[PDB]
């Protein structure tokens, strides 16, 4: 499954609403068909049914199953067997074992508890892992907290800390890195801010919970006109330089040039 | 010991000031009698005596002993053997071994050095551990630094980093989580900001160094009437919804409803 | 001995021997660079310069190329015919990479996700005498495009790695070196970074231009106000036992340690 080839705009779609699968697919780069928290306990069997009977392109679809050790997950895997879906998202991911027990599937580990943050490197390193995501809301919920963001809307420190932990663990083992959802759907400004930053630090994906968010996300992962203009400027300049040199008041060498090239590629 | 159901307002009181033990207990939800940095080396023997002579409710009292590998700690423990106290706070906690050697006692590990932060998971996992606290000042001290906060009062990055490290380590192992003391006694504004935020992210306790701070802390761990109203509205709303649903412009699913219920618990 | 020298350390590409003397005079320690400051085609010339224009080995570090690279092998061959005993290892990612540089002392430059994840093991390695972090390769290797946000602060993942390296170094009694300030003429920003670095116990701020050295050296010396407080509170402490209130603050041992650290940095 060529996840890196697909866009940065992924979308959660509750699996007990098969009448929306087609549109989610159309609006998003990758759809995450959700059997976990997006669907009530009593609608999960129906959700599983909808999953076998309403196929989306398995090359552009991931299924979030239920957490390790839950009876629900067992049901999910049985139902999954009647689909073409090769990639699953494991919520409350908390150990390498939880990932290993899903072989031979590809696994996107969703770290959203303190235990998962503590075990991030082991989780990322596990052989089936193809990506890591973080979730601020279960994180806060399982910490015994009540709020992931402060007054002004900025993530509180522990959420910011887990975000970095996941980005690092993912990158250290060559895994996709997926940034967290933006629950305030009409906060397009906040979303744009997060998604631009995500792209800047090397996240590959920002996950969305509403289709109106996908265009914002796609736009944000395209380098700004200003940044792109600089990239061309500094690269042209370096053609005439050997090793370190000063450009526009800044010391420039290898990795700075790599940043500019990455910007060009992203466009 | 039912520490988790004690209240979030803990108060340090140096153990060489027994005449102040009573005020301490009256003011706070839990008192930490201190044999370590709160008490000069020459006064520690008197503090060990005061420990025995002026007993407090052992259900609402923890004793901070001295660090592992010190002559002081050995005497602290000898003195504790003659008390009712079963829960100790271990300063400069730096390894699981330092916690384990304290069994069968319950141990709150106070991580306040780079080594302890680096071993936070191992320390939290140790069997006798029932809680984790962090300390910014010994952290900066042992780092070779000179201030834990920048000009505007915010903690410097390495301190904010260790705070999160300790919250996650504690919570990964089901331990109590205690937030760092607020040393600016007169800065009630900052204490309020910290305690509200601590409450928001799941710290169970904000440790105080002055009784005047306890009310500030207590008020901070109770959600706004505004947050409560919201919690009641979204929970009522969810009763007629299946799974994820949009509410007042927000996407709402399981953990959001948990947040709401947590508000209602911290309150009613 | 490196640990005895000032906090002002200066990179100088080793293909610029005519600059060596000025760098040595301007800075406490000089880091002669064989890696990213020098174009590949210029590396052999840089190695010759390293051999032909020596600096005081007690005040000089050589940054070699990364573990496993053909360049590093050539670097070490060149170095055998020098008096240099401390090297900086870029893209430091394991204890093993440090250990193979024995019997030299090693400053591990952590600047990749893998390096951040393995920071404690790298710091603990026997040859390690210090740790540095590199914001630009960190971002480059994460697949990102900028280490700093619009307001100039480092992005979170950079700030996160900064503390990781500081803690790892300190946990194992290693020197801690803060990242270069690429904006040469931005002495205001450099001052802010260095004052903060000194405050949290970094031992060195690395510079990329001689003009930055004075700024770093001043920032690592406490202000007159801070020095006055330090003398004040230490005086006050002798009349006090254990914890006591001083100027609105609670004071005990570690606060007095901070004071003494200010004094030491002042003479
Ligand atoms: C700062 C001090 C010395 C000033 O004490 P004061 O008497 O000079 O201040 P005050 O405002 O004049 O006190 C007035 C009233 O408050 C009482 N009072 C005041 N404080 C307390 C108290 N703690 N417990 C019980 N009662 C207290 C006091 O006795 C008096 O009662 P009164 O009106 O009836 O006469 C005092 O507040 C105190 O001792 N606080 C706690 C000190 C302590 O325990 N420090 C160790 C923990 S902090 C630490 O080590 C960091 C960490 C984590 O380790 C790391 O970051 O590295
Ligand atoms: C940027 C450059 C090329 C501008 O060079 P320039 O000639 O254009 O600058 P200048 O202002 O005109 O220089 C004025 C005078 O100072 C001198 N000078 C100026 N710089 C130095 C120096 N470093 N050492 C010794 N002398 C220096 C220079 O020779 C000249 O002498 P003069 O008065 O006789 O005319 C120059 O400053 C330089 O080479 N700086 C260091 C470059 C370097 O080593 N970069 C590698 C480390 S940064 C890195 O890789 C990232 C990291 C951590 O790995 C990751 O974040 O990933
Ligand atoms: Cl299918
Ligand atoms: Cl494995
Ligand atoms: Cl003393
Ligand atoms: Cl090149
Ligand atoms: Cl200063
Ligand atoms: Mg979740
Ligand atoms: Mg302390
Ligand atoms: Mg580099």
Residue numbers in the entry:
A (entry chain C): 9 to 275
B (entry chain B): 9 to 276
C (entry chain A): 10 to 276
Reproduce, without paraphrasing, sentences from the article in which this PDB structure was first reported.
In contrast to the previously reported structures, the C terminus (50 residues) is well ordered in our structures, forming an α-helix/β-hairpin/α-helix motif that packs against the surface of the neighboring protomer, capping its active site. Of note, the structure with (S)-citramalyl-CoA bound was obtained from crystals that were soaked with pyruvate and Ac-CoA, therefore indicating that the conformation of Rv2498c in the crystals is catalytically active. The CoA moiety binds in a deep cleft at the base of which resides the active site Mg2+ ion. The Mg2+ ion is coordinated by the 3-hydroxyl group and by an unidentate interaction with the terminal carboxylate of the ligand, as well as by Glu112, Asp138, and 2 water molecules. The carboxylate of the substrate is further positioned by polar interactions with the backbone NH atoms of Ala136, Glu137, and Asp138, while the 3-hydroxyl group lies close to Arg64. The 3-methyl group of the ligand contacts a hydrophobic surface formed by Gly135 and the side-chain atoms of Met133 and Val181. Because the citramalyl group observed in the active site was in the S configuration, which corresponds to the R configuration at the 3-position of HMG-CoA, we modeled the mode of binding of (R)-HMG-CoA to further understand the molecular basis for the (S)-HMG-CoA lyase associated with mammalian l-leucine catabolism. In this case, the additional methylene unit (C4) found in HMG-CoA is readily accommodated in the active site and can support a less distorted octahedral coordination of the Mg2+ ion (the bite angle of the citramalyl group is ∼70°; the modeled HMG moiety bite angle is ∼85°).
A systematic evaluation of substrate specificity revealed (R)-HMG-CoA ∼ (S)-citramalyl-CoA >>> (S)-malyl-CoA ∼ β-methylmalyl-CoA as substrates for Rv2498c. To investigate the molecular basis of Rv2498c substrate stereospecificity for the carbon–carbon bond, we determined the structures of Rv2498c in a variety of liganded states by X-ray crystallography.
